[PDB]
Amino acid sequence: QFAKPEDAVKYRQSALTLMASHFGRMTPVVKGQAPYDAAQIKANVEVLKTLSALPWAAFGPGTEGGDARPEIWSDAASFKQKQQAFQDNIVKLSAAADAGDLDKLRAAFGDVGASCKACHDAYEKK
Amino acid sequence: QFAKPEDAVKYRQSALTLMASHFGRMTPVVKGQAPYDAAQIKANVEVLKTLSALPWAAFGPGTEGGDARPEIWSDAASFKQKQQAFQDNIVKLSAAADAGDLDKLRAAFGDVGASCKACHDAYEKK
Ligand code: HEC
Ligand code: HEC
């Protein structure tokens, strides 16, 4: 869906920005600094689930650029392992949200955050 | 969810960028230049539906900036009419996609596009 590589870059950056806001806005809730409304969090995690699937297809062949380390295309299977582990971690977060359990949410949120950081450390340029 | 107004601006711009890619990538299909796969379009419209709901809450009080004309906050009810007409037009697009009908999709796509342009002309800075 991208006319030029720059268009894929701008898409993925926007998806990651949004996806990120939907993750990070839950931090006060997971810390107990804001109240826990199970329905509010369930709805937000549903948005995060949809967003979380979007970036990867905008790292297609020929889409090099932004802060994407070149190692993303040359090691495709591995990049794919990091992405699929992250979304599996998002499935767990959904399960915790859908069940309405703050303890399970906290644990699942932590796991997701670790997956974000793992991909960051390997595949995002300094 | 925004620490500073600039954070709301960056969110809404990213949401509009994404939302826009998901709309515009269907243009070749609606024109017949690309093939029509009903399931592909149904799935894409579902993503568009989710995205289409996201920008508006990032035009909250105190979030002035970007290319948002000042007229967005001083005329709140009206801004709201433009937003709600656009999402009603997105409901119709979903119905056309979910039914699997290229003629209804084309008409509904046109209606959505007109709603984008209407808000643009009134509320987006040159
Ligand atoms: C690899 C499988 C990733 C996972 C999982 C997550 N992110 Fe990431 N992110 C990744 C790359 C390769 C990049 C660079 C993209 C580019 O082309 O520039 C990024 C970037 C971000 C950004 C910055 C986006 C921008 O506006 O330029 C943010 C805010 C970000 N990533 C956040 C983030 C979060 C919160 C994640 C888990 C919820 C996460 N990312 C996962 C690669 C990967
Ligand atoms: C008002 C109810 C709007 C509707 C409906 C749509 N858009 Fe719009 N858009 C609107 C504003 C006020 C702005 C400016 C936001 C800012 O603070 O800068 C925009 C901006 C865009 C952009 C640019 C985003 C960027 O990266 O800076 C795009 C690509 C865009 N809008 C596209 C678009 C499409 C395709 C729409 C219908 C599917 C649509 N917008 C509707 C206001 C409104």
Torsion sign over Cα B52, B55, B60, B64: negative
- Which among B4, B9, B16 is the best mutation to test ligand 2's pocket, defined by most ligand atoms within 8 Å of the CB? B16
Q: What is residue B118's three-state secondary structure?
A: helix
Helices (H) and strands (E) in chain B, counts: 6, 0
Rounded-to-integer distance, Cα A114 and Cα B32, Å: 44
Helices (H) and strands (E) in chain A, counts: 6, 0
Rounded-to-integer distance, Cα B93 and Cα B118, Å: 17
CB neighbour list of residue B22: distance below 8 Å, 6 or more residues apart: B44, B47, B48, B51
CATH number at residue A92: 1.20.120.10
Residue type, B24: G
Residue A107 burial by Cβ neighbours in a 10 Å radius (0-12, 13-18, 19+): middle
Nearest CA to B90 among B26, B12, B7? B26
Give, in order, the Cα–Cα distances in Å from A106 to each of A19, A92, A97, B83: 18, 11, 10, 35
Rounded-to-integer distance, Cα B54 and Cα A25, Å: 14
Report which secondary-structure segment, H or E, holds B124. Answer: none
Count how many domains chain B has: 1
Rounded-to-integer distance, Cα A40 and Cα A38, Å: 6
Give, in order, the Cα–Cα distances in Å from A96 to each of A38, A48, A109: 10, 13, 9
| CB within 8 Å: B50 and A47 | yes
- The number of the ligand nearest the C-alpha atom of A112 reads 1
Phi, psi (deg, nearest 5) at residue A124? -105, 130
Report which secondary-structure segment, H or E, holds B90. Answer: helix B76-99
B27–chain A Cβ distance below 8 A for any pair: no
- What are the pocket residues of ligand 1 if the criterion is a CB atom closer than 6 Å to any ligand atom? A 9, 12-13, 16-17, 19-20, 23, 66-68, 82-83, 86, 112, 115-116, 119-120, 123-124
A21–chain B Cβ distance below 8 A for any pair: yes
On whether the CB atoms of residues B93 and B105 are closer than 8 A, the answer is: yes
For residue B93, the enclosing domain spans: 2-126
